[PDB]
Design a protein around this motif. Sequence first.
Motif, PDB file in Angstrom:
ATOM      1  N   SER F  41       0.823  -1.204   0.000  1.00 10.28           N
ATOM      2  CA  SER F  41       0.000   0.000   0.000  1.00 10.28           C
ATOM      3  C   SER F  41       0.861   1.259   0.000  1.00 10.28           C
ATOM      4  CB  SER F  41      -0.939  -0.012   1.202  1.00 10.28           C
ATOM      5  OG  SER F  41      -0.216   0.147   2.407  1.00 10.28           O
ATOM      6  N   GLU F  87     -10.521  -5.249 -11.946  1.00 10.96           N
ATOM      7  CA  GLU F  87     -11.142  -5.182 -10.625  1.00 10.96           C
ATOM      8  C   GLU F  87     -10.378  -4.272  -9.670  1.00 10.96           C
ATOM      9  OE1 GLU F  87     -14.160  -5.850  -9.731  1.00 10.96           O
ATOM     10  OE2 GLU F  87     -13.556  -5.064  -7.778  1.00 10.96           O
ATOM     11  N   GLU F  88      -9.047  -4.370  -9.650  1.00 11.15           N
ATOM     12  CA  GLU F  88      -8.306  -3.514  -8.731  1.00 11.15           C
ATOM     13  C   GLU F  88      -8.269  -2.069  -9.216  1.00 11.15           C
ATOM     14  OE1 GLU F  88      -4.267  -3.785  -7.927  1.00 11.15           O
ATOM     15  OE2 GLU F  88      -3.560  -3.991  -9.991  1.00 11.15           O
ATOM     16  N   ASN F  90     -10.827  -0.645 -10.709  1.00 12.01           N
ATOM     17  CA  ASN F  90     -12.138  -0.156 -10.304  1.00 12.01           C
ATOM     18  C   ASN F  90     -12.129   0.184  -8.815  1.00 12.01           C
ATOM     19  OD1 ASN F  90     -14.889   0.390 -10.087  1.00 12.01           O
ATOM     20  ND2 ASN F  90     -15.555  -1.629 -10.792  1.00 12.01           N
ATOM     21  N   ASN F  91     -11.380  -0.596  -8.025  1.00 12.33           N
ATOM     22  CA  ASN F  91     -11.180  -0.254  -6.616  1.00 12.33           C
ATOM     23  C   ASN F  91     -10.428   1.068  -6.445  1.00 12.33           C
ATOM     24  OD1 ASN F  91     -12.553  -2.190  -5.154  1.00 12.33           O
ATOM     25  ND2 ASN F  91     -10.839  -3.636  -5.146  1.00 12.33           N
ATOM     26  N   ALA F  94     -12.908   3.849  -7.153  1.00 10.59           N
ATOM     27  CA  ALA F  94     -13.799   4.054  -6.012  1.00 10.59           C
ATOM     28  C   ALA F  94     -13.092   4.760  -4.859  1.00 10.59           C
ATOM     29  CB  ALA F  94     -14.368   2.716  -5.545  1.00 10.59           C
ATOM     30  N   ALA F  95     -11.839   4.386  -4.584  1.00 20.09           N
ATOM     31  CA  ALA F  95     -11.097   5.013  -3.494  1.00 20.09           C
ATOM     32  C   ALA F  95     -10.746   6.464  -3.800  1.00 20.09           C
ATOM     33  CB  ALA F  95      -9.829   4.216  -3.194  1.00 20.09           C
TER      34      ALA F  95
END
Lengths: 142, 43, 216, 56, 193, 99, 136
Positions: F41, F87-88, F90-91, F94-95
């Motif tokens: 992260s 998918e990640e 799209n995450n 969203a974040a």
Amino acid sequence: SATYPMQCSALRKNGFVVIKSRPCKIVDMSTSKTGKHGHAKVHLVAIDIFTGKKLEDLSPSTHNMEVPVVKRNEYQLLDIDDGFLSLMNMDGDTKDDVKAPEGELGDSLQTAFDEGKDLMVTIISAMGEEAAISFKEAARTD
Amino acid sequence: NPVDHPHGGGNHQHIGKASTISRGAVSGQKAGLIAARRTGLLR
Amino acid sequence: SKITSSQVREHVKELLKYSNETKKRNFLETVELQVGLKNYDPQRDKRFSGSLKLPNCPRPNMSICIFGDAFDVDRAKSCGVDAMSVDDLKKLNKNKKLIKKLSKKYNAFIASEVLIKQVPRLLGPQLSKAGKFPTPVSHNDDLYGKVTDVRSTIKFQLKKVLCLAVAVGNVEMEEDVLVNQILMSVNFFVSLLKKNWQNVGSLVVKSSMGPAFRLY
Amino acid sequence: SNVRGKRGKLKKIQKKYADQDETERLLRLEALGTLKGIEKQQQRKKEEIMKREVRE
Amino acid sequence: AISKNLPILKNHFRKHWQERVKVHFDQAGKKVSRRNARATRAAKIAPRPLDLLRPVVRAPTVKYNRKVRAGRGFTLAEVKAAGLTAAYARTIGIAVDHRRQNRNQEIFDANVQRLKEYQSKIIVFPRNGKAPEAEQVLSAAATFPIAQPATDVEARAVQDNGESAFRTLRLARSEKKFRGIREKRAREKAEAE
Amino acid sequence: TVKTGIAIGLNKGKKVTSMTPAPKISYKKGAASNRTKFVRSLVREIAGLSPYERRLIDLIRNSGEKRARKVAKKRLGSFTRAKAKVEEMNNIIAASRRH
Amino acid sequence: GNRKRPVPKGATYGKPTNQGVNELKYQRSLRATAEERVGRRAANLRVLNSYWVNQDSTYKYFEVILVDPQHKAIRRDARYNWICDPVHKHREARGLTATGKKSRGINKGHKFNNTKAGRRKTWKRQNTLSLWRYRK
RNA sequence: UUGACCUCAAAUCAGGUAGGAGUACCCGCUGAACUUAAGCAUAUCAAUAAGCGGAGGAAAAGAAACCAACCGGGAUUGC
RNA sequence: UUGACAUUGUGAAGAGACAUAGAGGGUGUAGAAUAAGUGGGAGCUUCGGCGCCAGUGAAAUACCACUACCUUUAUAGUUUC
RNA sequence: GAAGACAUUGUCAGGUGGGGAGUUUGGCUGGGGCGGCACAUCUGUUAAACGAUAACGCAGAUGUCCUAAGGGGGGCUCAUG
Ligand SMILES: [Mg+2]
Ligand SMILES: [Mg+2]
């Protein structure tokens, strides 16, 4: 089939051949021995029927050359509009797919249709492409 | 002799093909008039 | 086929719903198919022309003239169809105003095999310019049968414009018949068309005095 | 420039004929014979119009 | 070339095969040197029995799963059930295989029992002192033979209840063959509203 | 998952009593730890996005996940990696929208 | 890039299956030839490993780790004194480094049946004709 | 001004190491054609001969990103 | 030799092509008129007016739709030169 | 100083390429070559009254055509004088 094979020596003058995938009509044939021992070679000079270009070649005499199927067909004009002739078949069939000729044949045909003769048109088919070669006038059945 | 040049050989001294050579020709072929726009004596 | 029978059934249903019930018209309304073809050139590509005969007639009452001989005129008296003889055509004497009047009078022409030769010589090329050229008939065949056939003819010819239109049928026919005729007409159109179902620009179904409905 | 094959020609003109005065260019074009061809093409176009008039 | 009525032969001798010809003239001498190596190894490890103890284990494929044979080494679970660590077992002469697993309780119990008998039969010397010499045997495999398990008794009572054992096999093959189409039909039946 | 006792069928094979052995630690090699999650992260925060990831962000914003997955399948190797990457991303969208 | 076949003017003098000159590829890696040139430069060292650092259109850039087998810190330190054994002279020249084994194909499995114990060793093993005293 | 650090040098600086030979066997690179196909070009000969680099008494491989589909086996090598 | 991708970064302008949101536009002569063409259409009407028969014109006119070709604005647009 | 993210370089892709490489370039046959096909077939004859039987023997023919010129039935008799 559209086209059929033949032998070079079997070919003779005023016959159709395929040269470089073009329907061609022979004007000249000449055979000369390759070497004293060897077989003669055939030199062929021909004219494309559609475009009028001169195409020549030299093959072995025993070699097989491709020969097209040429059909000459007889029709009566209906109209000349937009560079496309409209023709009329025996039994009443009509085609408009033929493009009008672009040369002095086309000019003479245009003047003849403008001044109103009944014109008999010969169109030839060879290898999927279509053109008009000559026109006459109907002496009887006016 | 034809082993030595493109122009060599024959029962008469003659070139054979045309002597004007393409610019895209390769080494050993460029013998003659390379990429000639015109030939002959102009008057 | 990109077009589906259920979608044809649906669009025919609101088409007949609008034509019959909501806004009825006194004249009988013909259902029209208007097509436009795509990625095609009239000048270079081959000009497709073809004809099909529908089973149930689109236009029962459309005016037809029979150019005909003695036998053809005598049969045409029984058929009840308008006719002028070879002597009548000679009496016309190639006058442009009257033959233009005849061309606007009659949508379709039926001519005999014998006289179809000199139909251009007596009448000239303005029939080919209009696009109404006489159809051949023989002594063996039935004239009224071929009148029904010509009244049921559907013809696609390319010409110069890249959009065509034909009359599929009447509003008043039954729904399955209308669906079958529009499907076989679209199939005939794509059979004539090269590179089928991809050079189809747009297919439009409409009724006479009706809005357009788009099938792909 | 939109029409096909124009760009390939343009590249060449820029590469070797960029430093050509108009007078020099004209002389070269005449020697190459390109000019004659352009004239002939135009003449043929004039001929086409003339034929239509003659028919009329 | 091809000739009278003879079978079609496939003799692969089109390379320089005479460059690679191994004739085992040294079979007898190699056997003699092999026995010499075994004897000098036994003299070098003079109390120890020249080979480790191997587990009994079930042979892999369906052609050979009817038989039982010797494995590479005992499972860590087996040696923990026997009651000694893997390092200590390796030092006292037990082959340990860290990468085989126990899924069969009968094989597990047989190997644990085999380890118990080995621990009962061996003598482990003290590391420092007297070394009470003990006249080695040369084959732990021969002192602990691999025995095929008795699967059944030789006489029983006939228990027949009418399935013929052919209808059963045929029905099992049929339901395996038409399994997935039946759940496909069941899924579309369930999602049919 | 017990065997049937017969030689063919769905669960063919001999019935033996099972043992269910202890799980091997190598079966959890790909498991994510807290420390590596924190490191990943942080370096994602530090480095940001690659150009193909940026144009994927534009493809979810404009042309939808089907075209995004097609371009990611062309860009990466396989459809599985393309699906996980979309998918990640799209995450991330969203974040960043929450940011 | 590729390895151009070093023949004068592209003439191969053989059957047309061997007339290729341009699109032929070297069987070892650029990492392998890099560490082999480094070993020839420092023949007194031993090549341990190599890794990619950078590249452009013309060059690929590697860094090679080397260990001195005469230094006493490697003569001692039993974790590393195996490199002082004379069987490890020019491991990168015999293909014994990581990329050398990768290029030789040394891996377990059904995908490596040609190259598992050595390609030429397996070829000799399955092209040998074995004859016994009592012929089987 | 002085003292560091980093990087790069020079010494007949202190101490070491490499080259060449041999090469039957071993580890790689590179690499044919004669021949066979009753011709011949894919193929075969052959992933061979010739050429080049590098070791040891053996070398290489080797403790599974394995084989399997079974009641599962269990590094490598060889027969 | 030609093209693509990489080496390959940093900035400005000007054109062009698609997607789908919508606008308007068409004058040789003759003919009441400005006829882009097609296809249906004899009745449509809101005015009880417009078409239809009829005039002219290759092509005819209401009332319907379709298809090109043009110009025309806009998009967290897609893009190429 | 010049040039500049264009050349160059790397990898693919199209063109060109006797400059070069490898290979091929039928058979029968009153020698071979040219000619012909006697190279796959059919009728009559040579052919010696079962069958078989050669020559680059003789006289010819085949690589098609036909929804009837196929199948069934009915009626009639043809060339010629
Ligand atoms: Mg010469
Ligand atoms: Mg290279």
